[PDB]
Symmetry: C2
Subunit: 228 residues, 2 copies
């Protein structure tokens, strides 16, 4: 903990926007070990609650600082402080849904601060999300590589649905530090394994507890060309 | 090797179709250890060669039998024989390209037989592919889960390009056994790590040697809900 990003950190989060025309607002706080890549957060729907859609769709919008890093993979997010960073992302659901996010990450008074403006549209009325018939996400692997001076991430996720099925979705993310380009050491192509799980929920999902574990790493498989 | 799929197997491949209006035809053969998940193949462009596009785009179209499996993950492909299986896939490149494939997998005379009909369109004339300025693919992780009686796979890949950049692409695959549904044991949601590398190439890419290593597995990260 001898630095800006300490062994243990806390975070604050303010989310707002709409989904399928419905306005809402969320607030949350938590902590974790940025170096072990572990995270836990408590969130409350302070407005528009109870949401007419599944909270799951908002899961990945509520913390890149908390990602474990091995040797050989420079930390894009950690190197970004005190300034912080931002990122934009578009998620597309196979059944029609589109979820766009704009987030700001800063560090105020030793605490991490998250502001995310979100907009969702086209979620089928008889869809698992709007019908709130979802049951958490499966883990996933994010693919990342340097692009346009920033960091690009590509994601593919499967959301469990009532009955035993899955609802597919993919997204591309763009992460950008607020620090000079010739300052930090940009990482190369790599992956990040994620496992975001819902711990608790009550009051028609008006209060939510979630957890995430993420680890940066290279492909396990051996290369014949001596490539990473 | 005491069964249909032996410790060591060979394979035959006949590819044909077009890309951006250009017709071509490829033939190839190889072998590998289906259980160690290793593969090597030699391919020749018997028609339309030299191709006016990068061979890389055809890489993932040339062998699901060769995938290592741990305990807990039933083998969808191996369980499919002697009958065999098929699969369909659509790849979409971020710059406009679309590559559709239809493949048949059979087992004739102890040898694996591949027939794949492919169609590509919309590859930008000043694109890395048509300009043949690509430099192999990076490894990737395929996401898979049961759907509509068959197996669905989702993929995200990055193709290296001249200069130091990457060209993105994703695809969804549908795999279907030719054996009864109540016969084999359908696997659940899981992943497959892939690392497809180009070994050799000559004669303006008219002859190509490639290798693949694939392993089925569950997410490495621990779950708090006791989920796989």
């Amino acid at each position: 903990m001898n630095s800006l990003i300490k062994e243990n950190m806390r975070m604050m989060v303010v989310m707002e926007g709409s989904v399928n025309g419905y306005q809402f607002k969320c607030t949350g706080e938590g902590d974790g070990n940025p170096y072990m890549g572990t995270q836990t957060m408590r969130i409350k729907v302070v407005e528009g609650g109870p949401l007419p859609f599944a909270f799951d769709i908002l899961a990945t919008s509520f913390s890149k600082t908390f990602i474990k890093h091995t040797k050989g993979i420079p930390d894009f997010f950690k190197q970004s402080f005190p300034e912080g960073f931002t990122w934009e992302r578009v998620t597309r659901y196979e059944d029609g849904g589109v979820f766009t996010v704009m987030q700001d990450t800063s560090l105020e008074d030793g605490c991490l601060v998250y502001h995310a403006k979100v907009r969702g549209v086209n979620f089928p009325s008889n869809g698992a999300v709007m019908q709130k018939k979802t049951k958490g996400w499966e883990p996933s692997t994010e693919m990342l590589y340097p692009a346009d001076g920033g960091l690009r991430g590509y994601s593919q996720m499967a959301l469990n649905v009532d009955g035993g099925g899955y609802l597919s979705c993919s997204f591309e993310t763009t992460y950008r530090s607020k620090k000079t380009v010739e300052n930090f050491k940009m990482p190369g192509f790599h992956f990040v394994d994620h496992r975001l799980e819902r711990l608790e929920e009550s009051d028609k999902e008006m209060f939510v507890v979630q957890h995430e574990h993420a680890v940066a790493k290279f492909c396990d498989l051996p290369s014949k060309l001596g490539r990473l």
